[PDB]
Design a protein around this ligand. Sequence first.
Ligand code: HEM
Length: 153
Amino acid sequence: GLSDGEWQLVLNVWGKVEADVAGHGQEVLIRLFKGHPETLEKFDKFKHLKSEDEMKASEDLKKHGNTVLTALGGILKKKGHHEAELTPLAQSHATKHKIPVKYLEFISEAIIQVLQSKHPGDFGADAQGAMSKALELFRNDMAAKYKELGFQG
Ligand code: HEM
């Protein structure tokens, strides 16, 4: 997994995110969308946004983003022991939202791109690998539940 040190780099870069969840959330969504338009399609709720400007205006985009990052935040802090937490999430996304794991991959990227854009100073070579490792662990586990739930294999 992640060493204890790796988990500390992660918990650390994450306390930056917690001083502003809604704004970090909002920018990760914008980037994912601007970046994988198709992922945009998954949200009824947001298909109708046609420009960055539009995404940036959306109260509800900003709120969905808080929610996404509040939920990851809660997983991250279990530092690995996030079975109880990952479950509801893999259930909902596998079966209701129908999110492919590739998408999880896109978001991970979106998330890392925001931390680099915003915390270049706190998000060095080490914070970088800590973080991406924590996120592949998360995808990998998501992935696992899918397989079992009997999904995208
Ligand atoms: C770090 C990755 C993610 C986290 C922590 C996350 C978290 C959440 C949470 C907490 C909810 C609300 C509760 C629930 O339905 O279980 C939700 C809903 C949803 N998620 Fe995600 N999600 C992630 C990635 C994605 C991705 C990549 C997509 C698809 C592009 C996605 C699509 C959706 C949709 C369509 C909804 C329903 C929102 C609505 O329309 O009310 N999520 N997600």
